[PDB]
């Protein structure tokens with residue numbers, strides 16, 4: 531029983547947890563509050579990177595476009611764009627730094643490139659994600675305030691989106707392969723989904739955190755045995771200044787993967 535382990539974990543943690551798992555092997559799913567909205571935090575950047583890859587399908591030079599951004603574009607959390615300030619970065623490098631370091635300048639630059647917040651939402655709509663809603667730019671989208679639907683999705687919608695994009699036919703093969711490569715090279719995810727997964731598996735993920743101790747992580751897991759698995763874990767807590775609970779996500783992963 532996942533449900534009772536999950537509820538116990540959630541009650542002990544004093545948060546709300548949302549979980550969707552899809553096993554693309556047999557098509558089983560494990561759902562917990564899967565249809566409830568949660569602040570997506572940096573997990574949006576997954577959907578952002580996918581949208582950029584979608585436009586690159588029309589525009590063969592898009593990923594190679596060199597972006598000479600300036601000092602003014604730099605945000606508080608931007609280690610990789612800060613690193614490359616002098617020389618600029620390609621759109622492709624911007625997507626990698628957004629996914630793998632969650633760089634906020636790289637994200638905001640890619641939204642500009644797509645032509646605004648609404649372009650990401652319209653992309654989400656094009657793939658059948660009806661729950662995804664991006665309302666603000668980085669980093670204002672991480673306030674994660676109680677009962678604020680801004681900058682939110684559902685675990686189920688996000689899992690279905692990751693499924694279609696990484697493991698499905700929503701993108702052309704070069705694009706979707708690039709999307710999985712970016713994810714596999716994520717550097718921020720060691721303590722969350724990765725830490726609860728068998729040490730011989732490969733995990734591609736995008737993390738997220740914000741106020742109210744919001745702690746999120748979305749992943750494709752490549753097992754040693756069968757087909758890939760999509761896991762989306764969202765978690766949020768009572769108080770604004772809650773510390774993130776990366777251990778809760780690793781625990782969920784332990785709980786979920788045991789079942790399969």
Ligand SMILES: *C(=O)[C@@H]([C@@H]1N=C(C(=O)O)[C@@H](S[C@@H]2CN[C@H](C(=O)N(C)C)C2)[C@@H]1C)[C@@H](C)O
Nearest residue numbers: 571572607632668669672718737738739740
């Ligand atoms: C989005 O989630 C944020 C950027 N992506 C992050 C991530 O995936 O780790 C963050 S948070 C990082 C870990 N916790 C610290 C923190 O600032 N929070 C607890 C809020 C640093 C990275 C800044 C960003 C847009 O909020």
